[PDB]
Amino acid sequence: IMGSSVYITVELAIAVLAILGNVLVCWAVWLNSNLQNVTNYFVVSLAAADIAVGVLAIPFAITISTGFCAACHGCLFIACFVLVLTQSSIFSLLAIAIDRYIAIRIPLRYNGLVTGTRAKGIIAICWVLSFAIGLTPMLGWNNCGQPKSQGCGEGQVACLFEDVVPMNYMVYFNFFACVLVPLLLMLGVYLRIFLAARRQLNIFEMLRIDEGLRLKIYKDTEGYYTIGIGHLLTKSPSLNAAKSELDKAIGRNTNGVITKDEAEKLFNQDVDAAVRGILRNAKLKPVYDSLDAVRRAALINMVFQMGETGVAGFTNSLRMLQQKRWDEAAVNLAKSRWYNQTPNRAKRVITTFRTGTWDAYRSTLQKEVHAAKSLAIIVGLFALCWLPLHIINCFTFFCPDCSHAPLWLMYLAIVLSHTNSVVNPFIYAYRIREFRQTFRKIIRSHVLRQ
Ligand SMILES: Cc1c(C#N)cccc1-c1cc(-c2cn(Cc3cccc(C(C)(C)O)n3)nn2)nc(N)n1
Ligand SMILES: CC(C)CCC[C@@H](C)[C@H]1CC[C@H]2[C@H]3CC=C4C[C@@H](O)CC[C@]4(C)[C@H]3CC[C@]12C
Ligand SMILES: CCCCCCCC/C=C/CCCCCCCC(=O)OC[C@H](O)CO
Ligand SMILES: CCCCCCCC/C=C\CCCCCCCC(=O)OC[C@H](O)CO
Ligand SMILES: CCCCCCCC/C=C\CCCCCCCC(=O)O
Ligand SMILES: CCCCCCCC/C=C\CCCCCCCC(=O)O
Ligand SMILES: CCCCCCCC/C=C\CCCCCCCC(=O)O
Ligand SMILES: CCCCCCCC/C=C\CCCCCCCC(=O)O
Numbered sequence: 001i002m003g004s005s006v007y008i009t010v011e012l013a014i015a016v017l018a019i020l021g022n023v024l025v026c027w028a029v030w031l032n033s034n035l036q037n038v039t040n041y042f043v044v045s046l047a048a049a050d051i052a053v054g055v056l057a058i059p060f061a062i063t064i065s066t067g068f069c070a071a072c073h074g075c076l077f078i079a080c081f082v083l084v085l086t087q088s089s090i091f092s093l094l095a096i097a098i099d100r101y102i103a104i105r106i107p108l109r110y111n112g113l114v115t116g117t118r119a120k121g122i123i124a125i126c127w128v129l130s131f132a133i134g135l136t137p138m139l140g141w142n143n144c145g146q147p148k149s150q151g152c153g154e155g156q157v158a159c160l161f162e163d164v165v166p167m168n169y170m171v172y173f174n175f176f177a178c179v180l181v182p183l184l185l186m187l188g189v190y191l192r193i194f195l196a197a198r199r200q201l202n203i204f205e206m207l208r209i210d211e212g213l214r215l216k217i218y219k220d221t222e223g224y225y226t227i228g229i230g231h232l233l234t235k236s237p238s239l240n241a242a243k244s245e246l247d248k249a250i251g252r253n254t255n256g257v258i259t260k261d262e263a264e265k266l267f268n269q270d271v272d273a274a275v276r277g278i279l280r281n282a283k284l285k286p287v288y289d290s291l292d293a294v295r296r297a298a299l300i301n302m303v304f305q306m307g308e309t310g311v312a313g314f315t316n317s318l319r320m321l322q323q324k325r326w327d328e329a330a331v332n333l334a335k336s337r338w339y340n341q342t343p344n345r346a347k348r349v350i351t352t353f354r355t356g357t358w359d360a361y362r363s364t365l366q367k368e369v370h371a372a373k374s375l376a377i378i379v380g381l382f383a384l385c386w387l388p389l390h391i392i393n394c395f396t397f398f399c400p401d402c403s404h405a406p407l408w409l410m411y412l413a414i415v416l417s418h419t420n421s422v423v424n425p426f427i428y429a430y431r432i433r434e435f436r437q438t439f440r441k442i443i444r445s446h447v448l449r450q
């Protein structure tokens with residue numbers, strides 16, 4: 001068996017798996033409305049680039065592995081086309097990372113800023129930028145436009161990737177600026193996502209989950225100006241009047257904007273007032289005195305939502321809370337009008353009473369980042385599959401007199417880069433239930449017919 005035949009077979013097998021697997025990804029998104037979110041718009045765009053890897057880029061790499069004679073501009077397209085697909089993948093991976101950070105940073109206002117129309121515009125722009133970046137050698141930055149391989153006739157060059165694509169482009173422009181910098185930005189974004197889910201939980205973070213945190217002055221449900229965690233500023237219909245109240249409480253001219261620490265200090269003063277009002281109430285003080293620090297925060301949470309008078313009306317639940325009958329107090333509180341009006345917030349507060357822990361709010365944070373862990377794996381696989389080729393290009397560039405990397409390492413690094421166009425659909429099937437369920441439906445019904 002020829003050594004070339006095993007390289008062709010492996011490349012064609014990767015191409016088939018890249019097409020079939022990523023067609024299934026787009027097919028699943030088109031079929032399942034539950035998969036038609038903005039995050040999957042970039043997943044589809046990422047899959048579209050991987051489909052093109054198996055249809056064009058991999059056949060292109062096979063032809064230029066021979067170094068045949070061809071025109072300069074025509075040879076550059078065959079060599080630089082995969083640079084367009086890889087750049088579009090980087091933009092799609094960077095967009096997914098930023099999208100998931102917005103999802104955990106402003107989880108209540110995520111859908112107002114992140115829209116489908118905006119995503120399609122970003123995708124269309126990034127594809128234009130990917131062609132400009134990937135096909136930069138065709139616009140002049142090439143090595144076949146200067147008079148001087150030999151044995152091909154003039155106007156024709158030996159179509160080898162390292163012969164026609166400049167190495168300083170492959171290292172400075174492509175690797176350092178267009179690959180390494182986005183990969184490091186994606187690393188910091190995902191790190192920042194994971195740290196926010198691992199944040200310390202307290203009364204400030206609990207109410208931030210229940211009532212939101214806003215550092216800019218906004219209008220509440222009643223049209224009144226608010227800041228921080230539900231801190232009413234004024235009933236007046238003047239933002240200037242609200243800013244004057246905000247500046248009087250912060251101690252600095254804010255122009256309606258405050259820092260997170262100032263919102264925490266403002267919220268801390270609101271807790272002190274709610275605690276002062278609880279202690280002066282003869283119904284609430286005995287219960288509050290008996291509760292632990294966490295369960296006291298759940299009682300303050302109720303006061304912030306309904307008021308001391310409204311909480312004092314829970315005569316039966318308050319006595320069972322004071323008697324440390326957590327499970328009995330949970331059943332009683334669940335049968336209240338407060339539970340029916342806002343069950344999600346009530347269930348989190350009731351769970352706090354049962355356990356005395358922050359588990360209900362920790363689980364809220366963990367649910368917001370579970371998708372980010374799977375999508376972060378895809379970025380690491382992209383880095384793992386492409387960095388060997390980049391590092392070698394650096395060795396050839398910065399050590400010209402060095403011995404070039406051996407042929408088997410070239411074949412391995414190039415094939416490993418093509419393999420990355422296969423791994424993503426497997427990740428979706430293994431870690432995303434909605435993708436896995438649609439994959440099974442398409443396969444069992446549309447493909448296998450039964
Ligand atoms: C494109 C790219 C990106 C992107 N986008 C990012 C980093 C690096 C690269 C990249 C790619 C190729 C390449 C060469 N070939 C044809 C080929 C196939 C098999 C064997 C051979 C031999 C005989 C060894 O020359 N040649 N296919 N890709 N070569 C180099 N230095 N870098
Ligand atoms: C540590 C990482 C994140 C940043 C450093 C960039 C790395 C990837 C680049 C920058 C400089 C590069 C070169 C530094 C110097 C050497 C020596 C030279 O005989 C060949 C390559 C080689 C080995 C390069 C290796 C890769 C290289 C180290
Ligand atoms: C994250 C995914 C991990 C899975 C990916 C693992 C690494 C990629 C597989 C390489 C095997 C094929 C590499 C060898 C290339 C073909 C064999 C060859 O080199 O033949 C050329 C011959 O020497 C001259 O014609
Ligand atoms: C024609 C387009 C559709 C062709 C599809 C057949 C070709 C499969 C190719 C690549 C695998 C794709 C990535 C792996 C997806 C597997 C999903 C799956 O089967 O998961 C269900 C299983 O029951 C879990 O337990
Ligand atoms: C190899 C290139 C051709 C294969 C890639 C493109 C085909 C797969 C694309 C996505 C499948 C689901 C989207 C198709 C939309 C069909 C439109 C319609 O039927 O109304
Ligand atoms: C999955 C669809 C794409 C596959 C079909 C495209 C055909 C394959 C492309 C060219 C393979 C053979 C041409 C180059 C021969 C290389 C000669 C050599 O190995 O030295
Ligand atoms: C699924 C179908 C995929 C088709 C892949 C086609 C592969 C084409 C590979 C290179 C063929 C030569 C193209 C460049 C020649 C132009 C330069 C010249 O004429 O000198
Ligand atoms: C799925 C179908 C994809 C459509 C494109 C098919 C493959 C195109 C391959 C590259 C052609 C462009 C490279 C050289 C162009 C000049 C060649 C010439 O003019 O004869």
Ligand SMILES: CCCCCCCC/C=C\CCCCCCCC(=O)O
Nearest residue numbers: 094095098099113114115118119125
């Ligand atoms: C232009 C290339 C650089 C952009 C790469 C990706 C950056 C955007 C990432 C996706 C964010 C998700 C959609 C949010 C829409 C942005 C809101 C707006 O238009 O200001």
Ligand SMILES: CCCCCCCC/C=C\CCCCCCCC(=O)O
Nearest residue numbers: 077120121123124125127128131135
């Ligand atoms: C000679 C080389 C010719 C290069 C042609 C490429 C120029 C067109 C730019 C990108 C085409 C891919 C379309 C992707 C945008 C559709 C995504 C969307 O808006 O939903």
Ligand SMILES: CCCCCCCC/C=C\CCCCCCCC(=O)O
Nearest residue numbers: 128129131132133136139140141142
């Ligand atoms: C068209 C959208 C915006 C495009 C800007 C980014 C794409 C890259 C554009 C061209 C880069 C050219 C870099 C010039 C390097 C020196 C030229 C040379 O030495 O030959």
Ligand SMILES: CCCCCCCC/C=C\CCCCCCCC(=O)O
Nearest residue numbers: 133168169172173174177178179182
């Ligand atoms: C995706 C983000 C892309 C950012 C592109 C802008 C950054 C470009 C930075 C410089 C790269 C090239 C540095 C030296 C130019 C080559 C010198 C020459 O040969 O003329």
Ligand SMILES: CCCCCCCC/C=C\CCCCCCCC(=O)O
Nearest residue numbers: 183184186187190376377379380383
């Ligand atoms: C250095 C360039 C960038 C390298 C890739 C950057 C993306 C890293 C993203 C997250 C890594 C994978 C996260 C999966 C969690 C598994 C637990 C673990 O092993 O750490």
Ligand code: NA
Nearest residue numbers: 049050089421
């Ligand atoms: Na890709």
